[PDB]
């Protein structure tokens, strides 16, 4: 178990520097289509679908608010992947920290090539940039991808990346997250507990793995330190710091 | 239309006396909506010179979006 | 060349016959696999029954 | 003086760290329980398998945790680092990416490990000669530049494995 | 608090809400009693079957089932 | 009023302010004018205008080695920007698209050869620069990279149906042939050129040539290998160099085929170029995901969690880590 | 300009003389190939289908 007495924060207004966050890489399997759907449309075959090494795939990520695209979209520069979908590239985000509104969310679209000159998404996740307490997040988050679709920037958004508790809560989700807590040192370790429950995470993500076919694409945001303290970028407006009168009528 | 006239002036008698980024925002996004509804006479002599006013705001997410409701109303 | 043109017509079909072909029998070897695979699944769950 | 244990004169932490699929399961079980299997479970949070051995005539307890590989398991804090006494790097000499990234997980055990960590870079799937990506000259070259110990494994063709965790127990002994 | 059903309820009498909710396997046997570890990190439920099952509180996962080998009541 | 007094004034309105944005110290800003209203500002400026001011700024995006999506961005807006500017600035655009064929971000090729099919499409280019084009790209066709091996099909199909069949089977199958598995004369349907290519070169072996310090030897020692099997050359001399020794043993021991020494010849300008770009770049270049705000001079607010709406949430982020500070600690402390 | 019209008028005789030099291919064969063919594909999609 950690510990930190003291939270050093700052006002999004108060950060001028660009947002960047590091599109890494993504895990799970994607789907191919059937003959039929090849015979449906032939140009499926040189599709990226049809290349038996991970297709070299990148994300362009575009910051929506309120529905509206803030920037145009950066994607990530071409990479091969080999045996894993692994970019681990820092984006530098067309938004700089004071220009996000509260409601900012990040729409990040994987797409493959899809015969010449055609690009098709292989999934899309949306994350908001504040938390629920309004702290910009950190960390490495795991965004779930939804196939087939594009990232989708309106809020509410109907390709949500971070399932929040209000909907059903996905074992895989929580277990997910208390996994991570668990790495950072947030949770209590207890070694025989550890080595009997992580070894039952292992079955349940296993098991999941096998029914659930979703890819997750993982997003790592940068971290603000000075003098070797964390600060936390929290939305606030630049502006943020009588109804009885005896004359005025 | 001939009630719309009226309305218009209720926004525009605040537009120069708003202090929250918040209600700065929701100025403009009034406009946005009445525009469409308002005769050209009364979109350039009473809508036009208040945007223009925004555009000077402290705030840079009014002034993007003062040039954003200044080219659609326009 | 229009006697040419039309020899690389039946070439392009031949090719593209071929890539079905060859499409169509793998098409039907993992059809029959799947067939196997949920036959293999039906007797297991016949007995789980 | 103090008090101490017949069951082992000195208790070492290891601790398997490397991409995913490089193989640091497969090291532990090779090592621990002289097992191997094709199946992939991919690790967890944590698993911690235990050897007892004899080493200079005094008794070392290896305790030899792994950790997860996928970054979906992974934090940029990492408490599993803390208090190691041994760290070991994995790659798969089949996957060029698994062993671009070895520099960062320097940069991790850096950043979190003990200060004296006695690192040990393990190329495993050594049993890949067909596969091999990343060659003992170029691999060696980056370990010698930062002085770690080195070795290529198969867990697999296991008898390369043993001489790695008897290595990690060695350069263990040598800062104990 | 077990119940018949196999529900292991822990009200929070703070928030009356529900702290965490475990669901044991009846097939385990019914719940007869069971013991919480003082450092809160894990609960073990003991069955009429013989069963003891062991959960991890942490994390709210059922670890590891093990019976009796006379199968007789906890 | 007086109609070209007022309309002067317009074209002189726009034309401060669109360069006054072509100038911007944000590239972003440049970019998104790009993809906002190039097409838009050609006719505000007028055709002869355009290629002396819109033009002459627009090339100074390629400029930039360091921000490769400017580059990207360039190819995409020069299309519209050379439409209006007319064939008289074909000249100008000539040496620039064959520079972006060759650049540093392997986008920018796929860029770019989408940029070369696109002006192909709209005969924005000239009838010699249309086959001269095609040699430089029909070497594509077998790149590793999918984007850029079917941004390669893209050109070629768009040049395929530009030119006459006559011209097709006289003068595009000839630099087509050594790419392609069997002589179609149907290469007009994408879907058929896309069947007969040839497959294309390993990235193991591309990424491994590309890669190499020594490319003019490795070329010089393949171009003997090649000269071997061309007959042209008895018996190839072992590399002179250990380095090419050492490269030609690791190509080899990769699966390097004889189809792929083929393929890396065909390729070897791309590969040439390609490689002294991306010497360029390393020549001009906190790399750690971390930003120091030391280094921005910005004092951050600090609360200490031991015991308006923007406010409320604020307090909200402080009652949540208040609150799960003291939650953390006390477990540690119950153990 | 007369340079590139003598290149491309070369070219042209260079082609013509291959194409009247490349032995003509039997259309009549190619099409009982393709009759074969189509008969596979049709046996194929009712396996398929079966
Ligand atoms: N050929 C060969 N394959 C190996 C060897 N070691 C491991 N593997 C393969 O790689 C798989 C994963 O081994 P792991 O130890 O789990 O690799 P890892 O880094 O721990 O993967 P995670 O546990 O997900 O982090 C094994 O199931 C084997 O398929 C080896 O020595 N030779």
């Known amino acids: 178990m950690g510990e930190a007495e003291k939270f050093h924060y700052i006002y999004s207004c108060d950060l001028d520097i660009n947002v960047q966050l590091k599109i890494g890489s993504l895990e799970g399997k994607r789907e191919q289509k059937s003959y039929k759907a090849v015979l449906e449309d032939p140009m499926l075959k040189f599709s990226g679908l049809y290349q038996e090494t991970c297709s070299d795939l990148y994300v362009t990520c575009q910051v929506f608010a309120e529905g509206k695209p803030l920037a145009l979209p950066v994607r990530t520069s071409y990479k091969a992947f080999s045996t894993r979908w692994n970019w681990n590239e820092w984006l530098k985000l067309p938004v700089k920290y004071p220009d996000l509104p509260r409601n900012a969310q990040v729409a990040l679209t994987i797409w493959d090539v899809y015969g010449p000159g055609?690009?098709?998404?292989?999934?899309?996740?949306?994350?908001?940039?504040?938390?629920?307490?309004?702290?910009?997040?950190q960390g490495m988050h795991d965004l779930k991808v939804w196939p087939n679709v594009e990232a989708d920037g309106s809020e509410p958004t109907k390709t949500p990346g971070r399932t929040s508790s209000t909907l059903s809560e996905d074992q895989m989700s929580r277990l997910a997250k208390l996994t991570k807590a668990h790495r950072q040192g947030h949770m209590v370790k207890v070694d025989w507990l550890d080595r009997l429950t992580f070894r039952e995470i292992e079955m349940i993500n296993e098991s999941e793995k096998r029914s659930s076919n979703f890819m997750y694409l993982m997003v790592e945001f940068r971290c603000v330190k000075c003098d070797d303290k964390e600060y936390g970028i929290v939305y606030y407006e630049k502006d943020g710091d009588l109804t009885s009168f005896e004359l005025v009528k | 239309?001939?009630?719309?006239?009226?309305?218009?002036?209720?926004?525009?008698?605040?537009?120069?006396?708003?202090?929250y980024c918040d209600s700065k925002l929701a100025a403009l996004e009034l406009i946005l909506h009445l525009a469409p509804r308002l005769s050209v006479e009364i979109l350039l002599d009473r809508i036009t010179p208040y945007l223009l006013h925004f555009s000077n705001d402290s705030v840079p997410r009014v002034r993007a979006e003062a040039l954003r409701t200044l080219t659609k109303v326009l | 060349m229009e006697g040419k043109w039309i020899t690389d017509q039946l070439?392009?079909?031949?090719?593209?016959?071929?890539?079905?072909?060859?499409?169509?029998?793998?098409?039907?070897?993992?059809?029959n696999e799947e067939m196997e695979k949920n036959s293999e699944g039906l007797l297991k769950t016949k007995e789980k029954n | 003086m103090s008090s101490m244990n017949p069951e082992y004169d000195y208790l070492f932490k290891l601790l398997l760290i490397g991409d995913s699929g490089v193989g640091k399961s497969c090291l532990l079980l090779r090592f621990a329980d002289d097992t191997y299997t094709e199946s992939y479970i991919s690790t967890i949070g944590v698993d911690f398998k235990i050897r007892t051995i004899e080493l200079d005539g005094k008794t070392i307890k290896l305790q030899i945790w792994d950790t997860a590989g996928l970054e979906r398991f992974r934090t940029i804090t990492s408490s599993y680092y803390r208090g190691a006494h041994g760290i070991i790097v994995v790659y798969d000499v089949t996957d060029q990416e698994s062993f671009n990234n070895v520099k960062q997980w320097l940069q991790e055990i850096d950043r979190y490990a003990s200060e004296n960590v006695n690192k040990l870079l393990v190329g495993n799937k050594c049993d890949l000669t067909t596969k091999k990506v990343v060659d003992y000259t170029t691999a060696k070259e980056f370990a010698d530049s930062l002085g770690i110990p080195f070795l290529e494994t198969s867990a697999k063709n296991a008898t390369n494995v043993e001489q790695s965790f008897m290595t990690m127990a060695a350069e263990i002994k040598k800062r104990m | 608090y077990a119940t018949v059903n196999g529900s292991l309820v822990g009200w929070d009498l703070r928030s009356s809400s529900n702290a965490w909710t475990l669901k044991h396997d009846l097939k385990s046997?019914?719940?007869?009693?069971?013991?919480?570890?003082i450092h809160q990190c894990w609960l073990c439920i003991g069955t009429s079957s013989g069963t003891m099952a062991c959960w991890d509180m942490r994390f709210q996962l059922p670890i590891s089932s093990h019976c009796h080998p006379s199968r007789a009541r906890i | 009023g007086n109609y070209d007094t007022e309309l002067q004034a317009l074209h002189e309105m726009?034309?401060?302010?669109?360069?006054?944005?072509?100038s911007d110290?944000?590239?972003?800003?440049?970019?998104?004018?790009?993809?906002?209203?190039?097409?838009?500002?050609?006719?505000?400026?007028?055709?002869?205008?355009?290629?002396?001011?819109?033009?002459?700024?627009?090339?100074?995006?390629?400029?930039?080695?360091?921000?490769?999506?400017?580059?990207?961005?360039?190819?995409?807006?020069?299309?519209?920007?050379?439409?209006?500017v007319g064939w008289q600035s074909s000249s100008i655009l000539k040496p620039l698209l064959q520079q972006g064929?060759?650049?540093?971000?392997?986008?920018?090729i796929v860029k770019a050869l989408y940029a070369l099919t696109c002006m192909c499409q709209l005969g924005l280019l000239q009838k010699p620069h249309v086959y001269e084009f095609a040699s430089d790209i029909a070497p594509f066709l077998c790149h590793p990279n999918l984007w850029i091996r079917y941004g390669a099909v893209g050109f070629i199909t768009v040049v395929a149906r530009q030119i006459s069949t006559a011209d097709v089977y006289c003068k595009l199958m000839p630099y087509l042939d050594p790419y392609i598995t069997q002589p179609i004369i149907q290469i007009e349907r994408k879907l058929v050129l896309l069947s007969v290519l040839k497959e294309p070169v390993s990235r193991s072996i591309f990424d491994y040539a590309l890669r190499s310090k020594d490319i003019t030897s490795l070329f010089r020692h393949l171009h003997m290998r090649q000269k071997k099997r061309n007959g042209s050359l008895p018996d190839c001399p072992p590399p002179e160099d250990p380095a090419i020794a050492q490269l030609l043993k690791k190509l080899l021991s990769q699966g390097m085929t004889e189809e792929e020494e083929d393929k890396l010849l065909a390729l070897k300008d791309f590969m040439m170029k390609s490689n002294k770009a991306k010497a360029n770049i390393v020549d001009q270049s906190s790399q750690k995901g971390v930003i120091d705000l030391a280094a921005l001079g910005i004092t951050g607010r600090q609360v200490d969690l031991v015991k308006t709406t923007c406010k409320t949430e604020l307090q909200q982020l402080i009652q949540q880590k208040r609150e799960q500070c003291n939650a953390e600690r006390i477990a540690k402390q119950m153990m | 300009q007369l340079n590139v019209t003598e290149n491309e008028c070369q070219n042209y005789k260079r082609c013509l003389e291959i194409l009247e030099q490349m032995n003509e291919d039997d259309s009549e064969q190619?099409?009982?190939?393709?009759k074969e063919l189509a008969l596979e594909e049709e046996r194929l999609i009712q396996e398929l289908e079966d």
């Not at chain 2, 239309?1 to 202090?19: F, R, Y």
């Not at chain 6, 726009?14 to 072509?22: E, S």
């Open chain 5, 29 to 37: 046997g019914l719940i007869t009693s069971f013991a919480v570890d």
């Open chain 1, 118 to 137: 055609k690009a098709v998404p292989v999934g899309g996740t949306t994350v908001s940039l504040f938390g629920k307490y309004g702290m910009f997040r």
């Open chain 3, 11 to 31: 070439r392009w079909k031949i090719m593209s016959c071929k890539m079905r072909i060859e499409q169509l029998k793998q098409t039907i070897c993992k059809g």
């Open chain 6, 25 to 84: 110290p944000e590239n972003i800003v440049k970019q998104t004018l790009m993809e906002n209203g190039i097409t838009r500002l050609c006719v505000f400026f007028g055709r002869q205008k355009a290629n002396d001011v819109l033009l002459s700024h627009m090339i100074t995006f390629l400029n930039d080695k360091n921000d490769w999506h400017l580059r990207g961005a360039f190819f995409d807006s020069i299309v519209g920007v050379a439409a209006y």
């Open chain 6, 14 to 22: 726009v034309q401060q302010k669109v360069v006054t944005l072509l």
């Open chain 2, 1 to 19: 239309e001939n009630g719309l006239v009226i309305l218009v002036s209720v926004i525009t008698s605040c537009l120069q006396t708003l202090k």
């Open chain 6, 101 to 108: 064929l060759s650049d540093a971000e392997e986008f920018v």
């Open chain 7, 30 to 34: 190619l099409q009982m190939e393709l």
